[PDB]
């Protein structure tokens, strides 16, 4: 499947794509304001994620640091990124279908839209200004809005036991981005697409 990744933010981002233990395609790339990166992702990719990293410095060997979404200091990512990060999440060709969603479970750094470019399903969007409205205790000094599990590390936030409910903090994400997952056991907002669809992820989809 092809994913077109588009940067519509006014600042540079470093896109990242990974399935947790390996990179998807080159795994990562600078995208200036307006730029697009098309990647190819193996069919049957399960648990893929694409996200944005902000304020990064890399050297010529491609090692460095990012203010949000840093995946072990590498330009070309192979593991998941350090929160806070809005996540486009997907699983391809799973008994005939594709499954996509956007998640705030690891916080929020950049607004995002995640849409099929082929026919037969809808996209999802989480474009609201969460960083500006973030409750004091979730503000990341580094930029972005952390999720409550990252800040507080309790069973109730992390849904360690599998019995958690919504919390004051998850209700803030849900109120601002009703189409994204706000905590683990949130009522699913996954979209089912035909097997083998293609996709666009857009950072800052709105003006």
Swiss-Prot record:
**Predominant location category:** cytoplasm
Instruction: Tell where it localizes.
Output: Cytoplasmic vesicle
What keywords are annotated for this sequence in UniProt?
Cytoplasmic vesicle, Disulfide bond, Signal, Taste-modifying protein
| Source organism per UniProt | Thaumatococcus daniellii
InterPro entries, per the entry? Osmotin/thaumatin-like_sf (IPR037176), Thaumatin (IPR001938), Thaumatin_CS (IPR017949)
Naming one, the record's GO cellular component terms include: cytoplasmic vesicle
Give all cystine bridges in this chain: 9-204, 56-66, 71-77, 121-193, 126-177, 134-145, 149-158, 159-164
Pfam families listed in its UniProt record: Thaumatin (PF00314)
Q: What SMART domains does the database record attribute to this sequence?
A: THN
Q: Which family does it belong to?
A: Belongs to the thaumatin family.
Q: What is this protein called?
A: Thaumatin I
Q: What does this protein do?
A: Taste-modifying protein; intensely sweet-tasting. It is 100000 times sweeter than sucrose on a molar basis.
Does the UniProt entry include the keyword Disulfide bond? yes
């Amino acid at each position: 499947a092809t994913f077109e990744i588009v940067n519509r933010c006014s600042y540079t981002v470093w896109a990242a794509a990974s399935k947790g233990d390996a990179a998807l395609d080159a795994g990562g790339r600078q995208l200036n304001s307006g730029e697009s990166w098309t990647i190819n992702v193996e069919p049957g990719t399960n648990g893929g994620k694409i996200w944005a990293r902000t304020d990064c410095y890399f050297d010529d060997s491609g090692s460095g640091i990012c203010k949000t979404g840093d995946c072990g200091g590498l330009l070309r990512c192979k593991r998941f990124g350090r929160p806070p990060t809005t996540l486009a999440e997907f699983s391809l060709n799973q008994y005939g279908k594709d499954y996509i969603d956007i998640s705030n479970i690891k916080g929020f750094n950049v607004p995002m839209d995640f849409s099929p470019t082929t026919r037969g399903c809808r996209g999802v969007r989480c474009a609201a200004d969460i960083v500006g409205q973030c409750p004091a205790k979730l503000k990341a000094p580094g930029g972005g809005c952390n999720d409550a599990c990252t800040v507080f590390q309790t069973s109730e936030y992390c849904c360690t036991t599998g019995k958690c409910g919504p919390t004051e903090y998850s209700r803030f994400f849900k109120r601002l981005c009703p189409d994204a997952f706000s905590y683990v056991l949130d009522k699913p907002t996954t979209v089912t697409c035909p097997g083998s669809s293609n996709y666009r992820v857009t950072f800052c989809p709105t003006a």
